[PDB]
Amino acid sequence: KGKDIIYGNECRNELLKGILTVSDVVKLTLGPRGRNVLLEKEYGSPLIINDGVTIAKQISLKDRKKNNGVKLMQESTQISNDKAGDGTSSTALMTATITKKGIEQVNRNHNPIPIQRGIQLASKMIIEKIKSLSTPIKTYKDILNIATIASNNDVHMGQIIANAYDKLGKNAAIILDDNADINDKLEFTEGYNFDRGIINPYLLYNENKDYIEYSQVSTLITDQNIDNIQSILPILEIFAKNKQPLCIIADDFSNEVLQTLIINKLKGAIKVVPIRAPSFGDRRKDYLKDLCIVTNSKYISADVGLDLNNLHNQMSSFDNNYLSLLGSANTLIVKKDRTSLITKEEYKKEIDERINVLKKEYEETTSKYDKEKLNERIAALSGGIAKILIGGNSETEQKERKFKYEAATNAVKSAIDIGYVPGGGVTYLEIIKSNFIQEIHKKIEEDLQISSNNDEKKYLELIGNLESEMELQKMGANIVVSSLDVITKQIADNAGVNGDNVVKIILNSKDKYGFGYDVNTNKFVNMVEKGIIDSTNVIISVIKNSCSIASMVLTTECMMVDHE
Amino acid sequence: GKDIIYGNECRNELLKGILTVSDVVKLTLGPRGRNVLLEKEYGSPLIINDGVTIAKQISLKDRKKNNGVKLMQESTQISNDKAGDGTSSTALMTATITKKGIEQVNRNHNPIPIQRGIQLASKMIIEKIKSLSTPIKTYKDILNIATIASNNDVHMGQIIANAYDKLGKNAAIILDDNADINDKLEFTEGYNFDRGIINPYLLYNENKDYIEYSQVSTLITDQNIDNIQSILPILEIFAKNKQPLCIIADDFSNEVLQTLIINKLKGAIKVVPIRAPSFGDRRKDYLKDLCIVTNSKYISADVGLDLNNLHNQMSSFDNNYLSLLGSANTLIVKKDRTSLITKEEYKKEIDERINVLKKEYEETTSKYDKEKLNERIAALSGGIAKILIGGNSETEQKERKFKYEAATNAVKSAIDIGYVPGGGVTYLEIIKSNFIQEIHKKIEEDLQISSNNDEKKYLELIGNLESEMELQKMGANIVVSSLDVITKQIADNAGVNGDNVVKIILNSKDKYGFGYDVNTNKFVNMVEKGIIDSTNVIISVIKNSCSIASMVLTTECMMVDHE
Ligand SMILES: Nc1ncnc2c1ncn2[C@@H]1O[C@H](COP(=O)(O)OP(=O)(O)OP(=O)(O)O)[C@@H](O)[C@H]1O
Ligand SMILES: Nc1ncnc2c1ncn2[C@@H]1O[C@H](COP(=O)(O)OP(=O)(O)OP(=O)(O)O)[C@@H](O)[C@H]1O
Ligand SMILES: [Mg+2]
Ligand SMILES: [Mg+2]
């Protein structure tokens, strides 16, 4: 055992070499007309792929030092974790460009702290500008276009997402399931979806699937906060002996009643999902009642006499059966913030009847607060869940398409939340052609003016040059700005056209916001008209990740590899 | 086969290892420290900013140079996972002083006078820092020391501050691992006396330096366990039960101090032998209180239950040996101040007992009895703070656990007479107030009271007097010249000229506590902006650095088993 330590410029240069390797291999696949990359498998078959994520997940350099940069970019972009969303391919290129431009300056006797400050400020200001340059999603064609673009121009899966959003609402919970066929079929099933998820993520340290999937679970819906573990202990023991999945929907969960026995034992012999009731006030009662009618769980609450702290005294109410007090559901899917449950085929009529009653109450009350509360309740009760059965020609193609669908759906969700901006890298070019660099310059100048003259003391002038601080801050800003034409230029270059000249045309022609070059038809058109649009969150995340990684590498001053 | 190396070569290689540790740790000094990349063979690289976490992984392939690294990893308790606050600064000061001293020793100089000067400078500086401390009075002071000693973590700092405000000026705090990511804070009724681990040998298995047992069975007595055959049935019963056992006796005779043997040789029986809390008759009363907090049948000859011959006539005990003991929720045995979390069942009994004691407080005039009874009631009541620490990973839990332990220990040392301006200005004060002349005067007097006392040429032929004095003051100068490294390194890591910051602080106007805040790039008052450190941390930093430097200077040989 022995470590090898390396500091300063050498460390930054090796990390930069790894980053540049990842970018040099990924930028070739940017755009729909990206080039192909051949990967030889020792299993005996070579694969020619054009997807940047698949190629990036296999890049690894023999140089243990340079490989650090590769691993760093594989983890910062969530590529190694198999959760890398859309835009990571562009993030690699932008990150490498910004990091190289910054490191070349830092290694030349410059100060990295002011450059990092300028990079971070430029990132924040550019994110605000991109937010101010976004447009909301209104028509269905917008959803179809964003889904197809975020799906590497896959019309089939794009249409699937579009139809999943049309037959459902703009808050539809879509579940991705594996299929045995070669086509991606779409189904719909009635269910309930609220706005609560997995409170303590440690519940996933057994199964590492980022979600919870339990089939035919028994529900225990209450209204109080489960504090005394000896209050629900008999039900817990019963389900621990039968080994059946259990879901508990309480209001809160005392500190010690969720760690001493729930999380540590589920990794032993018990299936429990502790979700909290979704509420903003007393409305919790109504939502819990709806959940108890959807699954027939016998609403537990002190208001209805059934107190969760003494269920042994009233043992002659629920017919002495601790299980007749519980409910049932087909499938339970608990995400980070949106629990979903598929209603059983038996209660279908009951809930339907309840829905009718609620409708009868909707046209019988005024003041707009009861009508809005009832409207939200009816919309939640009569909701649904879209099931996308994804398939492929191989076992690995299924997982690839699964990741593709996950990234596309996440992009569509971020697009229904925040707006959308024209694709093709024109959004990055707008901040360059509209002179936003002068705005960030003015911002750094004001931030330094409120600190230099304001502090009436020359104590800060000798510990550092003021003009040098301004020059370095604006230097970092210039570095972040000058590395925005790489996306569109690389996309056009991979298609076989002069990328730099395309950028020059887009920057010199003052057309509306969104004027770009379509590589599928090699023609200069309007992006928002032909449907080439991206979600604002994707672009914002791309620039934020690139700037954060660049600043982190600039701040890094030491490397340790266990080999000497 | 061994490889032996002496003198300057050995010292130079040890210094190279020490310098490696310092060069890798000083980059994280201060809140604006730089990042360090550590590659794990698992496949994931980690960007860390904590000096302790990075120092625990530095290891050189050079078996000889690696010795210095290991030396500093053990002297600062880093390898033992007991490194408190200030170790990051201790590394830098130790390396600077050690290099300055070795460079002088290697030039045919004498290391003994330099070592003497270093030790004297350390003692004098410690006394000066003690005289430069201020008492802690307001709660904001506790919050500030906790936040600063916690690597500027407002959450954990506030947790410690609230644990000390909502509790007494002792705050028995227990640190436990949690499954959540939000470090929660709880309070639980309990009993805390002034006894600890009478024999640290019980820690040769667990490297946690403390004892934490959940749902233990208590056996509280009043006599001295002299015959092991008096508790042998209970030990045999517990040999079958994999349940924790705690025995609170009065003296625990020499040979009955074998339970620790069965507990370590095979962990078959788990026994914690704590001693009586008081020195005298009050121990009986305290033991009775302990027997009321836990359902323990107080053993003593005055109440008839004698621990010797429990099979005598005219007794009640049915030889059962089991219901005679008590129970508790959790038992925490530290080096001192043992803690027991009261059970949710005996609570009312204790309340009643407390009330009875109060009835005796307003019924007696003897002030000594009212004081003893008041302390007893205060001990019965009270609470214990439980800090459930968590993280985003399994290793982050232990990392935050060590962080919380170091921060709480710093606050404990600060509640005593300890409070000093942060930012390394305390090290700069001994430089700005010409204290070097004070240490010079001390060595001059210590040598004058010895030079004119012999009145013969016996000491002048065995060594130059002026050279000896010059070397002693040389060691003192070495210790003094290495005090601006803390503030300079912090300012340098922040992106500003560190040396110029030190010159400004020393060449400032007439102020005392005036420093440079790197978080808001401004020269302000440390005591005003809450940037304060515990005097014990600074004292330990200087003492450890000087001790390690002197030890390295005295070393004259190295042996590595290789070639
Ligand atoms: N038909 C098109 N014409 C012009 N530009 C396009 C077209 N389709 C997509 N783009 C642009 O190409 C970019 C997407 O490139 P690509 O899909 O190769 O990688 P990515 O989306 O950045 O990351 P990932 O590979 O993970 O999806 C988008 O920013 C979009 O603006
Ligand atoms: N905001 C601040 N501005 C200037 N100096 C500070 C500030 N906060 C803390 N310091 C100084 O930095 C020192 C603490 O540095 P740091 O926390 O990096 O390592 P450490 O506390 O010496 O050891 P460890 O890393 O084990 O905690 C303290 O002595 C304190 O005086
Ligand atoms: Mg794509
Ligand atoms: Mg600290």
Residue numbers in the entry:
A (entry chain A): 68 to 631
B (entry chain G): 69 to 631
Quote from the publication.
Group 1 and group 2 chaperonins are two distinct classes of chaperones that exist in diverse organisms to assist with protein folding in an ATP-dependent manner. In both chaperone groups, each monomer is comprised of three domains: an equatorial domain, an intermediate domain, and an apical domain. The overall structure of PfCpn60 represents a typical group 1 chaperonin, with a sevenfold symmetrical cylinder consisting of two back-to-back stacked rings composed of seven subunits.
In order to understand its mechanism in P. falciparum, we report the first crystal structure of P. falciparum Cpn60 (PfCpn60) bound with ATP, which reveals the large conformational dynamic of the apical domain relative to the intermediate and equatorial domains. Comparatively, it is estimated that the D474A mutation slows hydrolysis to a rate of around 40 min. The seven subunits in the asymmetric unit are in slightly different conformations and differ from the closed and opened conformations typically observed for other Cpn60 molecules. The inter-ring subunit-subunit interface buried area of 683 Å2 in PfCpn60 is much larger than the buried area of ~ 200 Å2 in other Cpn60 structures, due to the extra 27 residue insertion in PfCpn60.
